[PDB]
Structure 1
Amino acid sequence: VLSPADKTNVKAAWGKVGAHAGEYGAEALERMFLSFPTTKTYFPHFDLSHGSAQVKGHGKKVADALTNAVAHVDDMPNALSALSDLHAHKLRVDPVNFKLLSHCLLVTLAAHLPAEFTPAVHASLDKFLASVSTVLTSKY
């Protein structure tokens, strides 16, 4: 379902992120906690203040899991299998929350990629984030 054009777009946009992956993951998490405060209840023992080391730390793990998913775009269910198990079985994350984080990741990419975030690239990144969400909610 992710077309060759979509894979090209995702790889080109995500490749522009590069070394800023942790920074952008932390920014997307902060956007989510501020816009959708109920999402904070999933991290009760985190310091969720602006610029917190725990948020920065978690943002880099989220961004690296996305970088791994871009490299394994042809076999995403296998690559994110263990992560699908954690979110559904242990954390019990409500599937509506994946749409909230995906939106905040897209908003962060739009804010940092003025030239690259065209309507076609936006549609490709949306398809990619929806495919990751589908995989992460598949173990219910």
Structure 2
Amino acid sequence: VEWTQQERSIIAGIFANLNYEDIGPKALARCLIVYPWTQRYFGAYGDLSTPDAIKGNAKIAAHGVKVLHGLDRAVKNMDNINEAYSELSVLHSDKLHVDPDNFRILGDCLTVVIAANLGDAFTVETQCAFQKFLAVVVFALGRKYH
């Protein structure tokens, strides 16, 4: 992908003062609630039976933070995201067995969460750049599935 300076700056700007402990849990919880099959992977995470339980689940919250911090390496390496995610793709495929369609779905939840959080700051061009960034990351994370 060819990035414009505006795109690189928007992406840096979203992450520079991101509250990961806010946004991360919101994104993953929302995903588990709106697309409940994504709970497949979280049998070891305890109570997921209702929305309230998922939103109060500190183990899922800690995972939301972990997944969100997982975008950090893309932000830092925007021209080399394929290479930066190759090992994480291997992991999600060979060890974790996560259906990569779920990456797309989580990104859509993350978008909704960041939209809610940023308000007026979530301009049309912000959405455009952030969508472009998520598409590249999600593709990257699907590459090593075989």
- Shared fold per TM-score greater than 0.5: yes
**In structure 1, C-alpha distance between the alignment counterparts of 2:85 and 2:64, rounded to whole Å:** 17
Alignment partner, residue 3 of structure 1: 4
Q: Is the 8 A contact 1:9 1:124 kept in 2?
A: yes
Higher radius of gyration, 1 or 2: 2
Q: From 56, 68, 81, give the equivalent of 2:61.
A: 56
Structure 1 vs Structure 2 CA RMSD: 1.4
1:11, CA displacement in angstroms?
Answer: 1.0
Q: Is the 8 A contact 1:22 1:61 kept in 2?
A: no
Q: Is the 8 A contact 2:81 2:140 kept in 1?
A: yes
**Amino acid of the structure 2 residue aligned with 1:5:** Q
Q: TM-score, normalised by structure 1?
A: 0.91
- Which runs of structure 1 show a deviation greater than 3 angstroms over 4 or more consecutive aligned residues? none
Alignment partner, residue 13 of structure 2: 12
Sequence identity, in percent? Answer: 36
**In structure 2, C-alpha distance between the alignment counterparts of 1:53 and 1:75, rounded to whole Å:** 33
**In structure 2, C-alpha distance between the alignment counterparts of 1:12 and 1:42, rounded to whole Å:** 31
Q: How does 1:24-39 map to 2 (within 5 A)?
A: 24-39=23-38
Alignment partner, residue 70 of structure 2: 65
Please state whether the residue corresponding to 2:29 is helix, strand or coil: helix
1:4, CA displacement in angstroms?
Answer: 2.3
- Gaps (5+ residues) in structure 1? none
Higher relative contact order (CA 8 A, sep 6+): 1
Q: Is the 8 A contact 1:84 1:139 kept in 2?
A: yes
- Gaps (5+ residues) in structure 2? none
**In structure 1, C-alpha distance between the alignment counterparts of 2:91 and 2:78, rounded to whole Å:** 20
Aligned pairs, number: 138
Q: From 93, 101, 111, give the equivalent of 1:96.
A: 101
Q: Is the 8 A contact 2:86 2:143 kept in 1?
A: no
Please state whether the residue corresponding to 2:94 is helix, strand or coil: helix
**In structure 1, C-alpha distance between the alignment counterparts of 2:135 and 2:78, rounded to whole Å:** 12
